[PDB]
């Protein structure tokens, strides 16, 4: 696409455009129709392992290098290509089908004839789109009109930026005042919008109406926007579409899907490179021993083609089928139900994760806040003691019909029920009209709405205890008592919450009594000095914060009438002024905020998902570092980190201060370096500065931390953190998220896990693995990833060992029997054909386990051995190479030594000994025996015996039915295998593996 430019969007009239806009389609698939085959082929053959077979097959076009039949070169290559292409096509088709669900959602569109239904994928720039309550916004729009009489709406944006606060949105003032929504099409208005960009929290634009005789222009900000991926909290809204498809704010924060390859596959590719290099060195030495007798290059080519099975195609086939088995097993595990595998070629990545970068909102939490603790200083009330609070309120409001603990409880509850910015919203339950519910205060139709979910939880709790907030206006508030009596309060003044003040206040007058009261609630740090002297605020606030709760200090100051008049006069005088209005107003308000009576401390919990603490503990014990990358704000992120035990209860936490330039960043980095065993909490902008100037120093300090929390993290910042971890540590990272702001870091990570979000699916659709709950991560790693990694390592190493043993056997057979002849090549091919009788026993290794699933779950320290690369390394590969050379040499030399009679006898003895040796080798390798492995072994042995019988009768051979053959094969197999059995027994007895203890 071309460089982004500002657009003029006319309301309605999508045809009025200076360019063509992309279709409003969310796309997660890696290929289209045109790029599918070239991309799949390139990603297949760009690696040496596949390109080697491709070039081996292509060399047979030259008649000088012809060796054997063409189909022997092309049928296995074609089968591998077909398997890869079918797998990729199935993946793409499933991705398209799953995208159709999001793209086929139906919305209402304003038209001249009326309202019509439109699918999400058919939305055009300039369409007037109706979005209902709790419905996802399908495209980036400007808020124009709402049905609610307050002239505003709340947006849930956690799928877009990971923030728990509800966003208050205001419609365009001109369009909201129109008598009907149909008048939007009868005016000549347009929106001049900025170019499509990546910033989620800023927008620059203008609304212009040319129909009015005086032209009307309105500046547009982020407060007038409804981005795609947000959810309308209540009411039905109308907006004009500005951006669609790939230019959506959510989509522009999303990277292109990529084809991932596992680290194990790269290691296998390196092993194949090493094997080919050894073969080429051997060919060079062989041709040098002949002193390059002429046409030496041709002889080198024939040697490479003759021993080309040293890199067997069966390695690739077995690995592909094994990955199929692992994905099938993951999709059918009922202990982690609903798990979806999308990147089916990387199940072994789950076994080697060093850093887990997790999202907070919607991944660790349920995005549901609950009131948990009420503390009065002398008595604390929890979830089990709320009955006492209810009884206290009941007695307080019964005595009036008919100091003390009841009075203090009542004052605290009334303060919580009044000091907030929550508005009761009444809806329709079918029978009852919206106006009827607002008149009788119907509980079932009442919904509490506020930007702060903590305030909503507080008001809901006060409802559960007896004091119900039933109505609120700009100047009035109504409370319902346990005696169904309404108390009317007049909102004289309100001081709305700001993140800089970290507190909120209100002044009310009780009309039933006439007394004026000033209420304030806020964080402990700011409210400690505001309240009177006490001996329990700091300690109790510390304990409640350590529990993981969001703590608020609730205070109260009774105001005399004259005091209120004086304050009101000074406040009005400060407000009417224009010079330092904010500062003078602050002087007045914090002049009012002093010597307040401390009422209570409140504790609100952001509820964690099921088994989050055990899952995090399991990940920690396995050697995995867990970082929290969230778009939410500092306080909630810290509270959740403590609640989830991402940070230990008695663990120091360093909160990175605001830094704006290089010097401040260096100073704070030194300050944090001076600490030990301290968790790190840093915001997105300070992180930006630190990564700009001190990326290496910050990365080493953060990797030396027990835990890192990055709050207010933009999606690009999350992806950058993932990339920096990969670049610095050199280890695998796994990103876990649930929202659209996690897609970039999921795609960037070596193993992306998407949690199915409550109101969005983009993270699940873009991830390598999709889970329904965070706790499924523990099993998905410790059982499935471990087993996949170990099985792949064992299977690949055994296939390579078998091919190497065959190569050694045929090298000895060619060098010691006849040097060069046609029957020599016949025996070469016969020896090569021995893998058919060991195929099923070898592939039965995909059923092998070292421990049961419960043992792996209960002992996470087994994962650290995987983190060290133990299953596949140079040591195990070298041991396998030595074993293969020894066994091949022993079999061939025993065949040529014991009975040198003929080609037939030596071939038969070596073939039988090799088959028996590989069967015993499979038996020796198995850790936990599955009945299917026994079936494979016995079936392969029976098939070989049947081959020895079907051949004995027809071709004239009687040498099989002889004691000589029996005992010679027995001795050869014993010499090949028994040393390995003794070595295995000694290794098990002396230095057992950690999982056996
Ligand atoms: C024990 C070890 C001792 C070693 C001592 C020295 C030995 C020297 C002998 C050989 C050295 C040259 C070949 C080495 C192996 C290839 C290494 C290599 O640098 O690989 C280059 C790439 C594969 O890189 P990658 O997989 O890491 O990519 C991953 C990165 N990514 C995918 C993003 C690109 O591409 C390739 O493999 C191209 C590789 C060269 C062409 C393949 C030749 C073999 C194929 C067939 C054999 C002959 C058949 C006839 C061929 C001609 C027909 C006319
Ligand atoms: C044969 C040619 C290769 C075909 C490979 C693709 C099979 C895809 C497949 O067969 O789709 C998965 C379904 C069930 O998937 P689900 O609905 O449980 O996923 C939530 O069957 C399965 O699991 C079995 C497939 C598991 C392996 C997928 C490819 C691994 C490489
Ligand atoms: C017969 C002659 C020789 C047999 C050789 C056996 C070696 C290969 C075995 C592959 C296999 O047996 O695979 C097993 C998996 C999981 O089954 P399980 O035996 O662990 O069940 C455990 C329950 N117990 C114990 C009752 C069985 O099933 C699977 O992956 C099924 C594979 C899914 C293929 C989907 C293709 C999509 C394209
Ligand atoms: C059509 C056939 C496609 C195909 O897979 O080729 C068959 C491959 C061949 O490789 P090999 O076993 O090492 O045999 C060496 C042989 N003599 C050679 O020179 O090439 O052998 C294989 O790759 C077959 C492996 C099957 C493993 C089990 C699959 C699941 C079975 C249940
Ligand atoms: C090379 C030839 C001799 C290999 C012989 C294959 C057969 C006979 C061997 C190989 C693996 C063996 C099995 C390995 C595991 C078990 C489980 C336990 O209950 C002991 C018997 C039993 C069931 C063995 C029976 C014999 C067995 C099936
Ligand atoms: Mg989230």
Author numbering: 33 to 434, 450 to 1044
Original authors' sentences:
To obtain molecular insights into the transport mechanism of ATP9A flippase, human ATP9A was overexpressed in the human embryonic kidney 293 cells, purified in the presence of the phosphate analog, beryllium fluoride (BeF), and then subjected to cryo-EM structure determination 1. The phosphate analog BeF is bound to the catalytic Asp391 located in the 391DKTG motif of the P domain and is shielded from bulk water by being covered by the 193DGET loop in the A domain (inset), indicating that the conformation of the enzyme is fixed in the E2P state. Due to the TM6 conformational difference, there is a space between TM2 and TM6 of the open form, in which we observed phospholipid-like EM density.
The catalytic subunit consists of 10 transmembrane (TM) helices in which the phospholipid-binding site is located and three cytoplasmic domains involved in ATP hydrolysis.
